[PDB]
Amino acid sequence: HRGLRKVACIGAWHPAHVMWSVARAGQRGYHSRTSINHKIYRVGKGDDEANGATSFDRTKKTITPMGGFVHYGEIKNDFIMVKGCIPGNRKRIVTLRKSLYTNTSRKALEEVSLKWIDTASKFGKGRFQTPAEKHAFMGTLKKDL
Amino acid sequence: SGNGAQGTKFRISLGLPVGAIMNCADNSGARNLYIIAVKGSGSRLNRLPAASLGDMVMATVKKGKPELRKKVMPAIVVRQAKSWRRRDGVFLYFEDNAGVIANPKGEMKGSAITGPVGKECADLWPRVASNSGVVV
Amino acid sequence: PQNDYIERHIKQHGKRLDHEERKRKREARESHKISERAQKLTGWKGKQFAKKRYAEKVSMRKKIK
Amino acid sequence: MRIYQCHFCSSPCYPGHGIMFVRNDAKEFRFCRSKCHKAFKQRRNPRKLKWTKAFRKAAGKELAVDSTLTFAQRRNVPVRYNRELVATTLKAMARIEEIR
Amino acid sequence: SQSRINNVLNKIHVAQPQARDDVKRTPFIPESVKNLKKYDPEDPNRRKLARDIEAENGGAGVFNVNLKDKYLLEDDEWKNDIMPEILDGKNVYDFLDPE
Amino acid sequence: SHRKYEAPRHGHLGFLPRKRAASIRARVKAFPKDDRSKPVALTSFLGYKAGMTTIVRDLDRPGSKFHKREVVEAVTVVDTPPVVVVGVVGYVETPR
Amino acid sequence: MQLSWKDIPTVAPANDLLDIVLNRTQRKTPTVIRPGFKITRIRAFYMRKVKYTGEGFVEKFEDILKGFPNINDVHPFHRDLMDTLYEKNHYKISLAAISRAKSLVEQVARDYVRLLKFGQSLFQCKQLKRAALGRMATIVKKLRDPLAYLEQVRQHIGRLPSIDPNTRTLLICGYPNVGKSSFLRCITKSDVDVQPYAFTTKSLYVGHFDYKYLRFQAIDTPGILDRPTEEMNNIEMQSIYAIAHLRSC
Amino acid sequence: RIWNELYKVIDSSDVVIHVLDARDPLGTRCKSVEEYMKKETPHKHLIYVLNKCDLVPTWVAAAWVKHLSKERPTLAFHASITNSFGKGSLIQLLRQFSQLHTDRKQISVGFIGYPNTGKSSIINTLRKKKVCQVAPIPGETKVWQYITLMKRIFLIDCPGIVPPSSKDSEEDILFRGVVRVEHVTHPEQYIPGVLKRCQVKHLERTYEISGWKDATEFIEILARKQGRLLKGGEPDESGVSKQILNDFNRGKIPWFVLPPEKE
Amino acid sequence: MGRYSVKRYKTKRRTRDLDLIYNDLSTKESVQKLLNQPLDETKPGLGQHYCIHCAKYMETAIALKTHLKGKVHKRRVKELRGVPYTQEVSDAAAGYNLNKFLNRVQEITQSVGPEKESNEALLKEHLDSTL
Amino acid sequence: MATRTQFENSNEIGVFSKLTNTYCLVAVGGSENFYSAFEAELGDAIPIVHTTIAGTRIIGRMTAGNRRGLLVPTQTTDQELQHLRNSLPDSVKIQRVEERLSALGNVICCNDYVALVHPDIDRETEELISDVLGVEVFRQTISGNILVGSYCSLSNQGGLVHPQTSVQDQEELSSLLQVPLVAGTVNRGSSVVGAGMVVNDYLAVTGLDTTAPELSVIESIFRLQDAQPESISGNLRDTLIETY
RNA sequence: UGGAUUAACGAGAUUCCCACUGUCCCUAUCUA
Ligand SMILES: Nc1nc2c(ncn2[C@@H]2O[C@H](COP(=O)(O)OP(=O)(O)OP(=O)(O)O)[C@@H](O)[C@H]2O)c(=O)[nH]1
Ligand SMILES: Nc1nc2c(ncn2[C@@H]2O[C@H](COP(=O)(O)OP(=O)(O)OP(=O)(O)O)[C@@H](O)[C@H]2O)c(=O)[nH]1
Ligand SMILES: [Mg+2]
Ligand SMILES: [Mg+2]
Ligand SMILES: [Zn+2]
Ligand SMILES: [Zn+2]
């Protein structure tokens, strides 16, 4: 009766009030968070060709995935590669502050040495990292002859 | 956890809640199993305890050797049939859920396990890595 | 350890180098710690303490008589 | 770091893409994506689906038995990491791609 | 007991069979172990014994061991190099082979 | 009457009120404190969040299960062109 | 159990047992009831008090019963050992006293609760509560001597060693001051007295030693004087029962 | 809840009738209640009625009484609403017992025993109408009740009791009908028990059954003959086991056990 | 995604991956072994009367007698016709281990397939002789 | 030279180590205590290799090899294949296998002259083992127990089988092997014998709680300590029949 | 001791097994 996606007993007899901790409905999202201790994997130069290449991949490719990021253009300037997620959606301005103390966790002292940077398409289930690869795999098409 | 599980076990998906009926994998004679509690579970209001691959549960033979019933024995899952994520990224999964019977320290009841066995489970328990023939 | 092992130990090695000046001072200070526990120790630990000390003083008066 | 060919799509599947199913016969079927995973599940024929290399390479489309296509055997004798050998390999691999 | 003697006859009676052919079989002892002098826990002139390395570097859960640095190539200089492992596609190792 | 079965509270009360932020540029509220003998150095930097991709890195994490093994995991890409200085501002400490 | 029982909790003396169990029923039960509540609620309050106190005593006792090594019908060597040690008679009769007391307090609770379900006022039920609890209290206050005995038997038998009756043994015996313990200390890793006086030990001391990769236990005994088997000691009858039951060199 | 009504009828009864069943008196006595009765109220004398006698031939119908009458009345009597042999030994014994208390103005007497032994049936045969329900279901009557007959001998019955011992049985607990066979999830794991209890002749004569061994083969035989097959083709083992145990209880399979014989 | 495909081809409702089937059909001893199959009691027909091309236990002699003469079993008979799509098909259709592909298809086209077809013939004759 | 030790805190040395007369493979878990105990007596004579098979620590029961060469399972990656390759010298013909069953260490117990094999090994492998390992193969089963790898240790001196090996089957196996056999038992009564110890022509490493009786019997059959050549197995008959 | 123990049918009352499932673990998404 009268709703199921709610809370049944929002209060005891006494008090005759709803307490500030009963968790009612209202605006979700658009808050202002602060995650800490995100590791910086790669500081990508902006003039450089072959960013998305490592000491293993050694195939010349830039970090923009095929057809650019989604709802965002392509990468051209200097960038930061952070392990994990980060609050806020794409296109949004983020601030990066530095650590407020001296972290004593070996995850703060270790050296990262990447092996391969996925650059497939994010717009649909892509499978080739470069358009050169796509072409080599599919072979010629009706149009190019 | 459980005793005899060598090393720490990371988290993989939880495919077998309590009430599941998996298979018996070894040649101990048990034909299938029933899960009645999973050892090392958490504690959360309403959360059904659930078992993963490599976990040690408390099973009962629902049908099997006529001379094995009415008791509850420690079992160890070796297949899962719920896509868990290997670390070198690939979500793999198996064909059915199956486990083997072991005495609480971790030692096999039977003698040889038939069918592929999870690499994670075999790594965790060193007495499956000895009585198994097909490690995934 | 088979039998009276701590006693064999005490006779062979001894006690802490200061187990005597700690016991002595503990004793001399118990006289102070009795009144502290009587002016603190609210709420039924104070009742148990008072009844116990009454028992003790009664027994000592019995004994000296 | 061992790029695999989808068992159905024959595409490449890079580390972190697709699903793998392990049969009780211990054969690991890798899949490029869910399209091919679900078609496998429904038991269709990758040699009768028109869009897949199994059908093409042996249905009259792009050639198969080629002198370029004999350098990609799975090596099971791993010798020695010679640096000049790696150098010649790196040249020859791009040479092969262009010729084929 | 007269049911345990026969039971332990298994481990008692162990066969020295007849070699069942003309071929020979010998223990292969390497020359490399002969000159090898046994190890001492006390004497200061004991081997370096990489436990000493991980202890003095060091830490039983912190020593980042060099899993390279002991393997046998032509020149050591490129023992601390990298295998490419991939190219524009088609993982390198599958094309790698002599000639 | 008391509660029969116990369960932790639903939600976190440190993050309240759950209301829209005051701006899109969320503000920094605390800065790495100081040291007047280090060389001058910025403590913050603002950029733009652009997508998220995947990575495989070899792990040198001694005493871990994935020591000397590869590991795949996600990364975010933030798009940070050079930032350019246009002003300075000085703050004095008052008993307020 | 067997082989150096050290798993027996602790026998708090009767005043301490009273304290422990009564304070516990005071702390781990609600203690505010008002004359105004429903007579059902009052009856329930005091019922719970009585039943809980009963359970607490009963577990305190059931622990001792299930703990002690049960002198008779264990193994003749140990049976006669705790005979010569802790007086078989007193042992059995004390533990029996404890079992009787356990039954008594179960009965006290199970009568007074059947009563309380007929109380008609806070005062009637409060009087029943005090009555049942006071009866349990005297029942336990009787147990002064058994518990004072059991504390020392526990702190003794815990220390008491563990010689398997059947593994390869080696008994060492003779007169005081001869060299029993000299031989033991000189043959196997132990700590047994060597000082130049008669009864340099007073109980059975053990020491293992290996031979043909196998385990052999050696047992030094205090010894025997002349003592024409009429007058002896708990010192001597230990060696007696040892040389009797244990079958080795 | 049950032992309450039990002592209610023990106390409101002027005498007690401890109904046994003919097929297993030594297992459905398990007294530990007569010890209490004799000592707390000695003036009630614990008549015995060995009900369902016909399932025990006249031979054992004599053997099982001959060595128990040396304790109590022990009138073995199979009950039936038209042909109840054994009633003409007790309908007048209890009545003379009623006359004995001629300064009571009445008498009230009560039935005790295991469930599914026949107490409601005995009321109904001594009254001649179903004033209480008869039911093969073990726990049919769940509350005591007074019943008027002869306007002097009031009758009462109580639900069945089981002296709570954690010993000596689970299988014979299931073999006495005290728990319904729809409340056990393992019904085929006791068919070996029935096949070790009862012998093979009447097993063969009942259904009849295929020539067989091996209670598991016995159950598959039962089911393939009865058409109790599920979705291909493994048949309804739970269902056939439940039927075999309903047979066992209701007495559609002969069974008994033998005491020291005729001396 | 809707209900038919999922509540039919679920991981609890699998068939037996006809590469295994074709393997089991190639070799005569496997044919005879899976054809005799000492009596078990769970499988619906109880062992006998079982189609080796499909993987199903027909209940009775008459049931299999009709099953063989149908469009389902004929569909699978034609499904099992050529090279059964090993993983090497999918890995050589991308220019990899093409030599292993060629050796395998050569064996099937020259050495194994003849015996396979001969054995399905003999098995048909045996099914008749029994039926 | 019967040098008991312990992987991190496990007695199953055979599932975390692989030992032979020319090299050793040890897992890379945790710390250099296990490997240091190995290098204590193995020293610098034979190459040791910190390694990993298919990204696990259980290597002794996934690989299988003798001094002629090594044989690694399918799911080993090419990177660690290359690591092993560089680590060992040229003689050890490392080679992958394509197989139905990965745990080769449990289905082939082998030494430098002959290798018993689980019954359902394939023919390609049945001849591939001859190709590289340099032996002759016989499909067998150690007293019913399939998986001959973890239920019969072996060296060039003698073999140790799990205690339930019947006498006649033991005679058949000893005829197959032309070398002695003893129905052994390790680690306070662990039937799995090959998976609780690793042994070769100059050494055997077994668990810690492997008691002195069992240590002594295997020492007598493997002729490690100087010198116990298989007659001391009959010398110590004054103990092994009393202990049972 | 001259009035007594049952197929079929059932929106009759209760208990159970198989199939099956978002009832639940533990929720998620779409349409009007
Ligand atoms: N010089 C010498 N003295 C010995 C020898 N054996 C025994 N003794 C003497 O015996 C003494 C040993 O005393 P214990 O071993 O304690 O004899 P005990 O007093 O009967 O020992 P307990 O029965 O355990 O109380 C030594 O101090 C020696 O004086 C021996 O071989 N050489
Ligand atoms: N063959 C035979 N069956 C009887 C006899 N007496 C009773 N029965 C049957 O057994 C069942 C026993 O149920 P009840 O009549 O209620 O007797 P009960 O043992 O007291 O059972 P409850 O009253 O439910 O506790 C009855 O339904 C009858 O169907 C008898 O004397 N012979
Ligand atoms: Mg002395
Ligand atoms: Mg009844
Ligand atoms: Zn497609
Ligand atoms: Zn068919």
* DSSP annotation string for G173-219: --STTSSHHHHHHHHSS------SSTTS-SS-EEEEEEETTEEEEEE
- DSSP H helices in chain G: 14-27, 39-67, 76-86, 88-116, 122-141, 144-157, 180-187, 236-245
Q: Rounded to whole angstroms, how far apart are CA atoms G117 and G106?
A: 17
Are D15 and B115 in contact (CB < 8 Å)? no
Half-sphere exposure of I93 (CA within 13 A, CB side): 28
Residue E19 sits at φ, ψ, to 5 deg, of 75, -10
Q: Rounded to whole angstroms, how far apart are CA atoms I22 and I89?
A: 15
Identify the closest residue of chain F to E65 by CA–CA distance. F62
Checking each nucleotide's C1' against the CA of H239, the nearest proves to be K17
Does some domain include residue H195?
yes
Evaluate whether chains H and A are touching (3 or more beta carbon pairs less than 8 Å apart).
no
Residues H33, H126, single domain; the answer is yes
Residues H86, H138, single domain; the answer is yes
| CA-to-C1' span, I1 to K29 (A) | 13
Checking each nucleotide's C1' against the CA of B18, the nearest proves to be K25
Alpha carbon separation from J237 to B96, E10, I42, J233 (Å, rounded): 51, 12, 52, 7
Q: Rounded to whole angstroms, how far apart are CA atoms A88 and H193?
A: 69
Dihedral angle sign, alpha carbons of residues G23, G24, G28, G30: negative
Distance from CA of A134 to the nearest CA of D (A): 10
Q: Which ligand is nearest to the CA of G239?
A: 1
Identify the closest residue of chain B to J9 by CA–CA distance. B6
Does some domain include residue H244?
yes
Going by their DSSP bridges, the two strands G169-172 and G205-211 should be labelled as unpaired
Nearest CB neighbour to G212, from listed J211, J215, J239:
J239
Examine the fold and report which residue of H127, H157, H187 is the final residue of a domain before the chain moves on. H157
Q: Count of domains in chain H? A: 2
Amino acid at A33: R
Question: Residue H147 corresponds to which tokens in the numbers above?
Answer: 């019943």
Question: Residue J142 corresponds to which tokens in the numbers above?
Answer: 């150690």
Residues H57, H126, single domain; the answer is yes
Residues H238 and H188 sit within 8 Å (Cβ to Cβ):
yes
Nearest CB neighbour to D75, from listed E84, E89, E93:
E93
Going by their DSSP bridges, the two strands G169-172 and G214-220 should be labelled as parallel
Residues H147, H214, single domain; the answer is no
Give the 3-state secondary structure percentages of chain B, helix then strand then coil, rounded to 5.
5, 30, 65
Query: Interface partners of I (3+ CB pairs, < 8 Å)?
Result: B, D, H
How many residues are listed for chain H in this entry? 263
Residues, CB within 5 angstroms of ligand 3 (ion) = G 200
Q: Rounded to whole angstroms, how far apart are CA atoms J130 and J132?
A: 6
Query: Interface partners of B (3+ CB pairs, < 8 Å)?
Result: D, F, H, I, J
Query: Interface partners of G (3+ CB pairs, < 8 Å)?
Result: C, J
Are A59 and E86 in contact (CB < 8 Å)? yes
For residue J190, the 8-state DSSP code is B
Does some domain include residue H260?
no
Question: Residue H134 corresponds to which tokens in the numbers above?
Answer: 């008869």
Question: Residue I28 corresponds to which tokens in the numbers above?
Answer: 């005569």
Q: Which residue has the tokens 């290997």?
A: B86
Distance from CA of D73 to the nearest CA of I (A): 5
Checking each nucleotide's C1' against the CA of H137, the nearest proves to be K15
Are B92 and D19 in contact (CB < 8 Å)? yes
| Residue J127 buriedness (CB in 10 A; 0-12 / 13-18 / 19+) | exposed
Structural biology method used = cryo-EM
Across the beta sheet with G214-220, the strand order is G169-172, G214-220, G205-211
Domain that holds residue H175: 170-250
Q: Rounded to whole angstroms, how far apart are CA atoms J49 and J83?
A: 9
Tell me whether residue G179 is annotated as binding.
Answer: yes
Cα of D36 to ligand 5 centre, how many Å? Answer: 6
J178 contact partners, CB below 8 Å, separation of at least 6: E17, E18, E19, E20, E21, E25, J114
Dihedral angle sign, alpha carbons of residues H237, H243, H249, H254: negative
Residues of B within 8 A of H216 (CB-CB) are 66
Q: Which of G211, G214, G215, G248 to mutate to test the interface with J (most CBs of J within 10 A)?
A: G214
Q: For B11-21, b where at least 16 C-beta lie within 10 A, e where not — what string? A: ebebbbebebe
Question: Residue B136 corresponds to which tokens in the numbers above?
Answer: 């995934």
Thinking of the domain J1-226, which architecture would CATH place it in? 5-stranded Propeller (3.75)
A124 contact partners, CB below 8 Å, separation of at least 6: none
Does some domain include residue H128?
yes
Cα of B116 to ligand 5 centre, how many Å? Answer: 30
Choice from H19, H28, H84, H116 to test ligand 2 binding pocket (greatest atom count within 8 A of CB): H116
Give the number of other CB atoms < 10 A from CB of residue H16: 20
Question: Residue A37 corresponds to which tokens in the numbers above?
Answer: 């201790």
Choice from G177, G183, G220, G236 to test ligand 1 binding pocket (greatest atom count within 8 A of CB): G177
Across the beta sheet with J108-110, the strand order is J108-110, J114-117, J136-139
Cα of I53 to ligand 6 centre, how many Å? Answer: 5
Residues J106 and B130 sit within 8 Å (Cβ to Cβ):
yes
Half-sphere exposure of H132 (CA within 13 A, CB side): 26
Tell me whether residue G67 is annotated as binding.
Answer: no
Taking the CA of residue G196 as reference, the ligand 1 atom at the shortest distance is: 27
Residues F31 and A97 sit within 8 Å (Cβ to Cβ):
yes
Residue with CA at minimum distance from ligand 2 atom 2: H52
Residues H153, H174, single domain; the answer is no
Residues J75 and J68 sit within 8 Å (Cβ to Cβ):
no
Checking each nucleotide's C1' against the CA of H183, the nearest proves to be K16
Angle between helices I113-130 and I28-36 (to 10 degrees): 30
Q: Rounded to whole angstroms, how far apart are CA atoms B123 and B110?
A: 19
Nearest to D96 by CA among D72, D76, D73: D72
Q: Rounded to whole angstroms, how far apart are CA atoms B57 and B41?
A: 9
How many residues are listed for chain A in this entry? 145
Q: Rounded to whole angstroms, how far apart are CA atoms D51 and I83?
A: 19
Does some domain include residue H140?
yes
DSSP string, G135-149: HHHHHHHTTHHHHHH
Residues E86 and A118 sit within 8 Å (Cβ to Cβ):
no
**Residues near ligand 2 (Cβ within 6 A):** H 51-52, 54-55, 78-79, 115-121, 134-136, 139-141, 159-160, 251
Residue with CA at minimum distance from ligand 2 atom 32: H52
Q: Rounded to whole angstroms, how far apart are CA atoms G107 and G115?
A: 12
Residues B87 and J52 sit within 8 Å (Cβ to Cβ):
no
Does some domain include residue H80?
yes
Residue with CA at minimum distance from ligand 1 atom 21: G181
| CA-to-C1' span, B85 to K18 (A) | 36
- ω into residue J227 within 30 of 0, thus cis? yes
Tell me whether residue G36 is annotated as binding.
Answer: no
Question: Residue G222 corresponds to which tokens in the numbers above?
Answer: 């205090």
Across the beta sheet with H15-21, the strand order is H75-76, H47-51, H15-21, H107-112, H153-157, H145-147
Does some domain include residue H263?
no
